[PDB]
Amino acid sequence: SGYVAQEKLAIAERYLVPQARALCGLDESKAKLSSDVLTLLIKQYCRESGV
Amino acid sequence: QLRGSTQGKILCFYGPPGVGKTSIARSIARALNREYFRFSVGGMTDVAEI
Ligand SMILES: Nc1ncnc2c1ncn2[C@@H]1O[C@H](COP(=O)(O)OP(=O)(O)O)[C@@H](O)[C@H]1O
């Protein structure tokens, strides 16, 4: 299937943010990203079944 | 420069033809020190070329 809007939050908090964080090599110590900022993102800038 | 080793990446540019698009590529090449090269793909249909 595609992916639910809320479901994407649980995605990005685990399987997506850390990955890009490992691509740029950062840690939250220098690069924190809360869940609320992520829900705001998907709420505004990206409503697409793909991630 | 921060995360150690070099990585590749893709990009795109767009706008009117003859705007200076191609020129910035070689300018990049002068910036990054890597070899330059270009080639057309317009209108190509057969895949053997790629
Ligand atoms: N910002 C710029 N700096 C230098 N040259 C420019 C710039 N913008 C346009 N040009 C000029 O535009 C012309 C076409 O540039 P180029 O990018 O090589 O061709 P195309 O637009 O087909 O890619 C060149 O003669 C180039 O000098």
Distance between the termini of chain A: 13 Å
- The shape of chain A is globular
**How do the SSEs of chain A run, as a string of H and E?**
HHH
Q: In total, how many beta strands of chain A?
A: 0
Number of helices of chain A: 3
Largest sheet of chain A: none
Largest interface: A-B, 3 and 3 residues
Account of the 3D structure:
- The structure is cut from a larger assembly and holds two copies of chain A.
- Chain A has 51 residues and is mainly α.
- Chain A has three helices and no strands.
- The first copy, chain A, has helices at residues 5-23, 28-31, 35-44.
- In chain A, helix 1 packs across helix 3.
- The longest helix of chain A has 19 residues, at 5-23.
- The radius of gyration of chain A is 11 Å and the shape is globular.
- The two termini of chain A are 13 Å apart.
- The structure holds adenosine-5'-diphosphate.
- Adenosine-5'-diphosphate binds next to helix 1 of chain B.
- Chain B: It comes from Homo sapiens.
- Chain B: It is found in: Mitochondrion matrix.
- Chain B: This is Lon protease homolog, mitochondrial.
- Chain B: Belongs to the peptidase S16 family.
- Chain B: ATP binds at residues 15-22.
